[PDB]
């Protein structure tokens, strides 16, 4: 099927400042941050959009922090609570009333082993779309 038009070329998630005392215990994390991927001008005949997520992951399985902060990972989930680690895919239905598709996602920082250290948090997740 023909591809829709990518509306969300860039999406920035600013976690802001997180303190080490709130990231000391294993499993501790930051608050959830809304992130949406939107497609438009979907051609007639194209009813499904599949997003493929890809990014550098560390030994924990989550997205590796390319920043200086140690013992910190990044997690991407859909609005249903399902984790979308690197290699994961998600399929949504196209809205034929507006010819668009949307991917309501959530992003947060977390420390799997706890003991997060001072430093920066940086990570980039690439998304590629397939249509049917």
């Amino acid at each position: 099927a023909k591809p829709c038009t990518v509306s969300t070329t860039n999406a920035t998630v600013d976690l802001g400042d997180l303190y080490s005392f709130s990231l000391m215990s294993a499993g501790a994390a930051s608050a959830w941050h809304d992130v949406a991927l939107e497609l438009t001008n979907c051609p007639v005949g194209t009813s499904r959009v599949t997003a493929s997520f890809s990014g550098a992951a560390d030994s924990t399985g989550y997205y590796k922090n390319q920043g200086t902060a140690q013992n910190i990972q990044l997690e991407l989930q859909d609005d249903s609570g399902n984790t979308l680690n690197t290699g994961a895919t998600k399929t949504v239905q196209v809205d034929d009333s507006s010819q668009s598709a949307h991917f309501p996602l959530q992003v947060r920082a977390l420390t799997v082993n706890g003991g997060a250290t001072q430093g920066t948090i940086q990570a980039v997740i690439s998304i590629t779309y397939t249509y049917s």
Binding site: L18, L76, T120, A123
Partner: peptide, 11 residues
């Protein structure tokens, strides 16, 4: 097609 950039700091 899309890029999600995550940024922040740990104090």
């Amino acid at each position: 097609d899309s890029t999600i950039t995550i940024r922040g700091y740990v104090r």
